[PDB]
């Protein structure tokens, strides 16, 4: 799935998300949890555990989960449209 | 200063970035060298040693090196103007 996101009429994006990692080191970045009020709430096509591939082109399947907070909430300062870019997991 | 970089006329940047901090944990993300072909030699204005704040709006004071380079790589793969903001920091 993409997922462009309208941002004019919404504001907030509306998602915590998670690093996840087994021992082995084979994971990703994942929707934490779709706030009640945001984009994504409001989409409706993302769910909590799915997998955070891609956000306006900047992949997300190798960052640092503290790098991956910050970069999104500067492409969420950017005006305009965000493009999240997803696998759905399926829980 | 900000640095906007032309991409048009050029095709690739011409910088490796590196992480440097002491043992105290303060530190960031700095021109490692500018390669002799690109925009960013091109342009003249940045040097070796200058610390990398921010990327297309995007913050740098608190990324992981590898996630700065591979971060600066997928802004470089979107089409158009590359905004460097940079402390000039006299070597």
């Given at each position: 799935?993409?997922?462009?996101?309208?941002?004019?009429?919404?504001?907030?994006?509306?998602?915590?998300?998670?690093?996840?990692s087994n021992e082995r080191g084979d994971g990703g970045i994942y929707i934490g949890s779709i706030m009640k009020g945001g984009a994504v709430a409001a989409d409706g096509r993302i769910e909590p555990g799915d997998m955070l591939l891609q956000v306006n082109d900047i992949n997300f399947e190798?960052?640092?989960?503290?790098?991956?907070?910050?970069?999104?909430?500067?492409?969420?300062?950017?005006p305009g449209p965000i493009v999240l870019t997803v696998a759905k997991c399926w829980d």
């Open positions: 799935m993409t997922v462009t996101l309208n941002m004019e009429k919404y504001n907030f994006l509306g998602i915590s998300i998670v690093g996840q190798n960052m640092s989960n503290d790098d991956a907070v910050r970069v999104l909430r500067d492409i969420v300062h950017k």
